[model samples]
Target chain A: TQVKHMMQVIEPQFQRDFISLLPKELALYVLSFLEPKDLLQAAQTCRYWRILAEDNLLWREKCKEEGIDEPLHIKVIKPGFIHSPWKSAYIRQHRIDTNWRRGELKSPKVLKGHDDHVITCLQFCGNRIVSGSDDNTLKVWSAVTGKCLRTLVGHTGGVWSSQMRDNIIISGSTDRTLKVWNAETGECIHTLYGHTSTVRCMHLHEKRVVSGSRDATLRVWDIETGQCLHVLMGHVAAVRCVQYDGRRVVSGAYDFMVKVWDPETETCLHTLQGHTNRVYSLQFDGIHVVSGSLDTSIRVWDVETGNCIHTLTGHQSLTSGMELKDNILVSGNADSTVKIWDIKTGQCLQTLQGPNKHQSAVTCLQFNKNFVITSSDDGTVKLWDLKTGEFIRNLVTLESGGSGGVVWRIRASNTKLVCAVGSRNGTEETKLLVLDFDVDM
Target chain B: PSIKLQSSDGEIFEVDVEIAKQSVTIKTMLEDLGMDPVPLPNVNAAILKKVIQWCTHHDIPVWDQEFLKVDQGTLFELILAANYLDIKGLLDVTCKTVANMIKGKTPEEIRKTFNIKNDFTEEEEAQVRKENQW
Candidate 1:
């Protein structure tokens, strides 16, 4: 009794909660004791699964064991993409709120644009949404309000390709001309007559726009004065795609070959060969030139050595679009799927497919640190968890099912998924379905 | 150097700072806050004594004797205490010990061992079991 009284007085007022009852870091520390097999067992043990799967730093490490980063913040939605689940929406709002308090990027800012012609390509930057479409026009909009700032209207044919740097917009048309427009004034500043066929692809650099055309020729234009500065001609057929990094231009074409050119000297520096079909997509990070072909393979070439580095294969159909960030490549294919690859090693990391995976050819895709946003001919725009290859949810589903609906293109930044959906037979209404997931503002 | 650690039952133990360093929780206290006599309110005299004895692995009895050393409640108490004191290895051994007791038991039995309520509703229970079906 005396000892209890002295002990109570010796160290009094020490009251607290249980360690197991602490926070996720504690739960993670405790659960780290389990094996991989046990982890599979433990997740289903309770409803606290996602707390340890995402948003918990310790579980991010816990997930490292399974070769996955904690998945990106998953959203809340109904099965049919009709009504937003109040639970997920409220929770998402809280996290997006928390992200802002930490001064981090949160909530998506979507920019709406030209009604239902195929949104061929998208350019999203600091505060600009420059969307070019088969509508034969381009709408320059602000990311802040999704409001159209100006419309450039001189392309007689569909604006197949475009590039934007602040207020300067350069667009290539099937009308056999490249138009340089001042985005702020909506004026066609310069009209450079060059390629005699549909100018399909382009890359914008410091002061040049490298234009690839179905004319089987590539032209380097000075967007500043509307001048065709250099005509790098080596491909025996249509030049379908190009990538320019200020000094060099890499062009892929119907000739089944990739050519690296010195834009300044107008010299064909290197000819990368191997694809037996028309090369469709090209990604150049100045060191390696990656080319995707209609032949069902992707080739990586050393920009300087002029040798094929690796041939990425696995697609059952043509590879259409690809984005390269460092060593990682996310390629969208005509096979109704998307593949994540290590372009350097030529290894396929994950084939993004499950039961509800894309039901048709993936038309356009863009991935950042967290998620991959892909739009397809299936008429739904879906989001995938980048690290785990798990399907998060469908962001959009057009009412027009099989026959008519197609989401032609999609582009994303840190916060938004800008999708362009339309139909050839008057299916879904043709317009920019700008969905705001941005909780930050 | 050893620092003074006060347990929940108002008992003080002189412990090697290195042993205390094992718990990031306590290590944060000694280094970050420079707090002495790290008051472990969540760990009482009973469970704290069991954890300190567990620090020297050689001092622990075999599995059954180890189980006899403390009841499930005391074992759980020490787990909370070991976790509170930031003693990872001891907590590791203790939880694995409880996990062993759990190996052949039903989920219902395992929850009872730790005094864990079967919080899953009927529908939720069906879902959880169905997911773990494999």
Candidate 2:
């Protein structure tokens, strides 16, 4: 009698065999325990599922319940190069002014070079700047004196990404390989190869390295053993960017999906899809996933729900590069402008246009405690004030023995050193440029 | 009806209402604000006239989507103008064009087409080469 009464009470609200057909809110409440990717699939089951699937606030609350920080109201510092500081201060870019702004008030000395376009990427190593370019070669420069140091060679393809650890410098290339070098000696140590196509993006995490390739694969490599650990496959097109957060690796691909993987198991844990076009770049904001795409959009995803919490739009070109610093998100686009947005509200804060006009495209960008640096196809580097968005000075590069070229990537080591890579003249003549910006105490 | 636009450089362009309305900024001004003889201070008269002529010939309601298939340089300029005038459709189409250009090409090809130069040092180049390898 009791069972018969319960069934009678529930029959109008739900069918016995079709118990899955619950109210959308109830369904989502139940689906919350599943993985984010699963929740997305559940939402696709029917129209009722779509409503619950698209509820971003519900996921945001869920993330908070899972002990993740709620999405803070972050401001997108005008779109240019931005780097997070290991300590407190950050480096930001103001492409037009050619000056680097440190902290809140100090206007540091300019990093000058590159004849035509501004320099991008600024990697910090104590006090040195290691930069790369489209010029087809990489050069070293004194960041303090704004003097060229040494030029590195051996790449037949243009350099796109670079990193440094102790005495080792690592770079990713369109030629489909990663090279290890001795920063002090400018000598190639080992060439790591496995990707079948262009290796466009890379990240180093302790002894493990991750790379994304145009062949639609994410490769995990053991730098110490020099062995390919695992091949992560799922994307239908090119993988444009990869990032790791200790345990998991996240990759953005041309299929407009961002996949998270367990590096140890080589298993995909979640796949995020919301952007309408190719996902070009991505970064982790400690708790959330931030991605920029050719869709001319920036999306903030709830890491727990796999739901897009916010979609930032307004960029007039493809978003190529992006960085997250504290509460700020900075993005660079092909429109020759960088924009800063409030991550929480998806609102535009400001826009910084590249300085003296970019001759070609603004490729990569980097920031540090004192300054913001940007690289451009016009073959130049520029420093800018972070707070007010003012141009500082251009970093000059000596012509490689070939055709005049452009700077592609830039990185800074600590607050004193910076590095860039590119070509000296044309695509065939690759070069690397480095700068040291340390002041004697 | 024709609308007149004056550029920052003191140039004037006369364009058909239907053609000029492709720019949401102008359409809004003409319809919502009831303003005519609108002046665009950010664009030069010559550029405005050329833009108007282009819009006039391609005045189909859905032509905005096709206009985005043009080259990067032209698309970039159109986007800039659209941004300045708050022309939503023009901005969307122009940006789409630039994004399409970046769809399949490598970073190097993007730099070349846009005229960017390489500026890394030899050591930095070696470093990047090392990092990018599998």
Candidate 3:
């Protein structure tokens, strides 16, 4: 006991200034393991610690892990000096995350348009929000001001699906046609026609888009030339969802099959078959094809070998939507539940189902590295912790909830969430709700 | 086979060749120059002895868990020794162990832990605090 007490007395005497004494590289290696929050606090210690904490390459790895693809534009106040842009990006993200968790809900921007018509799909890009409706029209609105900029009215049938990139907007309609429009001028640049039935879904990559149709076929079109580049014909029933990654097309159909197609060759490369019911939603990251079906199962398939890798079964009803980033997949189901999965190991990491889970069928969902946002037919939108699967809070809860109101669809960017809400029985007015979570740096 | 190693304080240690080869510097020295007494000028005797003890034990679990329960000065010396001797495993664990010190600590707490001087000017401190405030 005496020796142990003597050791305690000697410990403090031997305490060294580790960070100051170590080589710069070694000191940085020690600081590199700190999470962004700790790193920010550690920066306040001293000048040298601040310098090491703000190392551009150090925060670049942290940003990469957080799924921040590129560094933001650095503002140089002093000439020839660029502060750590990535570190700023990380701190900005952390503040935004905190705001999303507990920040006061500022009055949302209520975008009122597409009156009484069901919003079938919604697309949100930088500063621009586009909503498609069954009223045979689509409206472009400023996400900043909540004003309808222009109305796109050319499709003879309801606009069912849409994709946007920069100033380009592509919409598929029940009129059996797809139109590429300039979002700035609201002009129909090109009308793509080929599908014998309703154009149900489309995925856009670069200058090319692949559209799936109720005609049981898929078409690859050049959005610039308005030319039908290739036709894919194999599915016996309606194609519900399609994914395109420049080189390959992956589609899920009502025929209970998922097919990988080489669009240039117009050949079906792999016919992934296993689902017992109609396949509804799909996510493709070039290597793995994940399909969710009405059979209450999600399947992970190898795109190269055309083999079913894993059949993830747990949800009690149809999985209507899912978002995949890297190896993490967050799926929403008609069972009023959400689940996070690791497709690499075929393990269900967390199920966002508990007391505060969605009360009705999940309609749409999106996830980032930190959080998952989900909408449901129960007239509510929820934010959840992606890592812990804990419910953060109800982002939107309609006054008419449980009577008839429903949140039909949702799309999210880093700083905003756009939700399309309405009700068939008129309990809730048809409109878009825009919530901002951005912070001034 | 055994190898004779000399530390910076001039104390010599006779160690198993396999255990001594855990450091890439010693491995390359044996391969290239084939020196009798592998000299490590960067590591002191106390820290060199700990490095050899770590090399004798394989990787992780209770052994490393208990082995790294050291004072900050000794831990500091071990990191320097590992880095200079080019022992990747030791470097990683020691660095990670040091990181655990700053993790989940407030700025004031971190300064106290490392005995760091707050060298920022009053205006500079306020600016940094504002910039990083959650």
- Per-candidate clashes come to 7, 154, 0
The best candidate by TM-score is: 3
Instruction: Give a tens-digit lDDT track for model 3, residues B1-134.
Output: 88988998998889898798999898788777787888899998899999999998752356665687898888888888999888988887887788888887588888888988776677777766876676
Tens digit per residue, CA lDDT, model 3, A104-128:
6676788877788888889999889
**lDDT (Cα atoms) of all candidates against the true structure:** 0.69, 0.55, 0.84
Off by over 4 Å in 3: A1-16, A72-83, A264-273, A303-307, A425-427, B1-6, B12-41, B56-61, B117-130
For residue B24, model 2's alpha carbon misses the true position, in angstroms, by 67
Q: Against the correct fold, how does model 3 do in TM-score? A: 0.86
**Candidate 3 DockQ vs. native:** 0.55
Shift of residue B80 alpha carbon in model 3, Å: 2.4
- Give lDDT: candidate 2, residue B65: 55
Q: Which one is best on DockQ? A: 3
Shift of residue A43 alpha carbon in model 3, Å: 2.3
Candidate 3 fraction of reference contacts recovered: 0.78
Interface RMSD of 3: 3.6
Q: Where is the poorest 10-residue window by lDDT in model 2 chain A?
A: A83-92
- Writing each residue's lDDT as its tens digit, candidate 2 over A338-429 gives 66666777766555564453445556566543344656565655564445455555553324312456555655443332434445434423
lDDT of 2 by residue, B1-134 (tens): 78776666776667777788887777777788766567677666645654675567652236665655555545555656666666555555554444343333333453344333333346533432222221
